[PDB]
Amino acid sequence: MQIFVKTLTGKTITLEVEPSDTIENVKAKIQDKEGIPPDQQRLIFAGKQLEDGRTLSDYNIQKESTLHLVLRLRGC
Amino acid sequence: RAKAKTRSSRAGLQFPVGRVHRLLRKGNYAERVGAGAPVYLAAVLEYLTAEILELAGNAARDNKKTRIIPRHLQLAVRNDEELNKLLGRVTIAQGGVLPNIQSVLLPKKTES
Amino acid sequence: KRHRKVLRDNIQGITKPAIRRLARRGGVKRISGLIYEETRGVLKVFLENVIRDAVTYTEHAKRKTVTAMDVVYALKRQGRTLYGFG
Amino acid sequence: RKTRKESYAIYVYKVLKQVHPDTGISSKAMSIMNSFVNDVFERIAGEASRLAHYNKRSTITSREIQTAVRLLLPGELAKHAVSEGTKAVTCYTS
Amino acid sequence: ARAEVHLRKSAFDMFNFLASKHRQPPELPMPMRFRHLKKTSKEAVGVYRSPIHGRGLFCKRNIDAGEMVIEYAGNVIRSIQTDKREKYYDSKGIGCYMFRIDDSEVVDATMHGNAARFINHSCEPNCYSRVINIDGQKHIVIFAMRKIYRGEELTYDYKFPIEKLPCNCGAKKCRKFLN
Amino acid sequence: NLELLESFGQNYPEEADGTLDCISMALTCTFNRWGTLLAVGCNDGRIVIWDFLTRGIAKIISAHIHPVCSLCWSRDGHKLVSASTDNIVSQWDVLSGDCDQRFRFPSPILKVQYHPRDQNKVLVCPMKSAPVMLTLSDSKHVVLPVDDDSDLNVVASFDRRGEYIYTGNAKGKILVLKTDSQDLVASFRVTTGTSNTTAIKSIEFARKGSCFLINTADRIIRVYDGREILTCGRDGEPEPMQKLQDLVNRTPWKKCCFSGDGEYIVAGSARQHALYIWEKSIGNLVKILHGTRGELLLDVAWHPVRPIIASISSGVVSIWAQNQVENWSAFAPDFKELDENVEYEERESEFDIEDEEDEEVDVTSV
Amino acid sequence: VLLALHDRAPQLKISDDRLTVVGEKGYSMVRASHGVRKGAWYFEITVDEMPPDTAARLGWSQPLGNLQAPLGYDKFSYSWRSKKGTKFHQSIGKHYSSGYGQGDVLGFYINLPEPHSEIIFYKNGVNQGVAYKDIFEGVYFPAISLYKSCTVSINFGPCFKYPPKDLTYRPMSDMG
Ligand SMILES: Nc1ncnc2c1ncn2[C@@H]1O[C@H](CSCC[C@H](N)C(=O)O)[C@@H](O)[C@H]1O
Ligand SMILES: [Zn+2]
């Protein structure tokens, strides 16, 4: 499942992942390929927040879709 | 199970807040203790310690010594104006006094 | 507006038989003429150093009136303990 | 082996090396600073406890500590230590 | 009054500081006091319109006999550049202010300095100087002589060996010369 | 506009600097677009305008008998809109001060605003009923439909660009509407506390970007980004950029506004009359201010391109900017006031060394 | 036989070896009392490291100069610039010849046969230009206005690195 994460800055980023991965795998992959601090990988599912404590298969998104990340400061 | 962010660094200070919270529970000062008081009090104690140690370090350099011996502390408190009013009835051990001679005890010259 | 608090006097309101009268309660025979200004200065200093703590307790209690207990508490802090108002 | 005793030596070491890079301290100066911090702590906690008994409350909040510092410290040093305390608490919250 | 041919215009050089309200009143070890000096020399003194000659350095805080007043600091030159800088400052029409420390170097005050350039001369002074050691770099420190009140323009003697330029200051018991 | 060579370490306001001891009984304050004027309402229904550069009182206009409690400037700076207990949709000129519109419509108004680009669209926030948008010539009024109808306290506004209409009830439910077709594109209930909701006092916006503020009633100012609402869309669940509160005194707020660059946030007490200033990005208090210690704060402004802050207390409007320090070398740039022994040897071209325009610039351009 | 004790700038880094000095914060024209009056004498100046903005003026000066004054003021001294080869002497600016590099083996030769002079810039024993002519009365000391912190080292011994080609001189280890 190659997800797209196009942010609000035209920063599209791809990750070919499994449908049964956790949030920590996505954190490790984005921190590997961009060094983005993983306290800002908030994602949006039809308005509602995609919470960062579950697995990917808990929401049943259509495979190889496009999401959006928000530049966030959490622990300052 | 999470990160053990100690209340010193979670605040952004240098004085501990656990020891302060223990010495406010176990001093019989009140029944219940809030959770802003030991932080605020740690900040106040830190700022006074920094205030005196700045002047102590300045005098310690300015008498050409490395360390700080308490004569520098006596000079640093009693030269300042507000810290002398705080430490009103206080005798620092090994302190000494300010050098002070009155205006009429020393001679003066008139002729030629 | 509505508040008429333009006051300039009242250090002169402590008049000048009054300090003479306090001095002759104190047992004082003969007084110079600068004692009046010096006494007004010392009285102003002392009443400032009491009214400051009085207003601090009044604000911390979250009120608008300075009851007598607060004045007693300020003077208790100063060292001049006062009896007969509690 | 002795029974462990309180002291504030390490924290004076840390604040001293934050405000002067290469200026040490003696032993007697460390005992003076220890007793100094103990003094200021006793006075402020006493004033706050007396305020708590006057106001018919039972809990030391931060409000009483602010009032005790504003009473006991003379003028401008109080107007700086209040700002230090408020900044530390607000950086502690978030 | 524009048709009038007022020609007070250009008879002197370019500089000014006049017309200020020059009427305020009618009336420890070494490096700690050096710190005190760098603190309080701004609030102690002031340069204003003199009646003696142009401008001068006044005094505002009541000074006891012996304390430090100001440091006469500026650029730092050696003994060679004197004639070159004097020829340049004479070419541009600029007065030359210098002060020798010792047998080594001289402190300039022309292009860069402080508010201490502006002390006139007398022969009954109330200021002098010595040589101190703030970590090797020696300095020029203005002591005092007697209790100076507020409003007085300050003076000091220049230690001149009696050796052209006349006495354009007018002291009381002066020898009608600087030298 | 001003000096460009001035920035010798510019600052952020510290001092008291002197106030307007001219006319008391002030009630509200707001600047124009550039930050050159300041309309101030009186107690009897008048207008006080103060010019900044000359530091002079510009114009006094007597509007009505009811006290003036809402003001806004047009984009050109020529149409003042206002409303009060007089119930009247007003519109005023800055060269003349004319009663151009007069429509006494009930449930008196708490806030007005123009659309930030077209001055034809104006905002109306009633005493009870839902907020109304109008035109200028005809009485085409657009009441926004509210599912609640139970608070009778709804706040709404336009953002920086005028793209959408952010609306808010007194239950803390937000209904984003498109600025012309009223498209309900986004909705969120505010995640107040653990579960229990709160009211909404006011909502304001910025001058650069889409960061904005939420002024609730649980003493917690919240900061969101409007593009996050746009990225959510319908049934949004935004969590804020930065949360704000002061639990030492537990102080509910009265007024907020942003900086000129969207970097700093000022907010004022309802109790102590003491102003606080925050950083948007890193997220901490930077400075506390004070004033007359026992007065009741009403309204706080900010100056966009220059660090000047306007307060209101006891009808007195303060102005706080640095009490700035002047020195030498502006009278004589060839001399610079040093402090200590400065050495001059780094150039090597000394000791008697002798070696071996065409830009046409307009004078009446812009 | 070392560097100078009397005729030095006192603030220099005249270390315990007294052969290598680091330049100070001015035109520190250090001289040496081992200077010539007349005859045939030559040594080397084994300059090793020369950082940027550390110039050096090369010549032979008379003992009545100043320690802080740079080379080439009047008949006492003759100077020359590193960059662009621009000699400055008696308040004259003349872009003259080609300069030098960094840390070469310098040292000039002067000859007074018993009124007439041999004044040529010797850069590693190479003709680089005739500076001046007809020197006047006095002893001649090696004076180099060491500009800033540079690594120069005077050479004394007979193991000459770049001696002049077919030029005769008494060696400089026979005076001190
Ligand atoms: N009374 C006097 N009148 C004119 N020049 C004086 C003087 N006393 C000293 N001088 C010479 O003039 C200089 C005084 S500095 C003069 C003060 C200031 N620069 C001004 O323009 O008003 C000194 O270099 C001194 O050599
Ligand atoms: Zn004279």
Automatic annotation (TrEMBL), chain B:
Q: Name one Pfam family in it.
A: Histone_H2A_C
Entry's Gene Ontology cellular component terms: nucleosome; nucleus
What are the record keywords, sorted? Acetylation, Chromosome, DNA-binding, Isopeptide bond, Nucleosome core, Nucleus, Phosphoprotein, Ubl conjugation
On the tree of life, the source organism's domain of life is Eukaryota
Share an example GO biological-process annotation for this protein. Answer: heterochromatin formation
| Gene3D superfamilies per UniProt | Histone, subunit A
User: Which stretches does UniProt call biased (Basic residues)?
Assistant: 1-8
Q: What is its main location?
A: nucleus
Instruction: List the SMART domains hit by this protein, alphabetically.
Output: H2A
The reply on keyword Cell inner membrane is: no
**Ranges for domain Histone H2A C-terminal:** 81-112
Q: Which GO molecular function annotations are given, in alphabetical order?
A: DNA binding; protein heterodimerization activity; structural constituent of chromatin
* Acetylation found in the keyword field: yes
What residue stretches are annotated with the Core Histone H2A/H2B/H3 domain? Answer: 1-78
Compartments in which it is found: Chromosome; Nucleus
Q: Would you indicate the residue range of the signal peptide?
A: none
Per UniProt, subunit arrangement is: The nucleosome is a histone octamer containing two molecules each of H2A, H2B, H3 and H4 assembled in one H3-H4 heterotetramer and two H2A-H2B heterodimers. The octamer wraps approximately 147 bp of DNA.
What's this protein's function?
A: Core component of nucleosome. Nucleosomes wrap and compact DNA into chromatin, limiting DNA accessibility to the cellular machineries which require DNA as a template. Histones thereby play a central role in transcription regulation, DNA repair, DNA replication and chromosomal stability. DNA accessibility is regulated via a complex set of post-translational modifications of histones, also called histone code, and nucleosome remodeling.
The record's similarity note reads: Belongs to the histone H2A family.
- Name of the protein this chain belongs to: Histone H2A
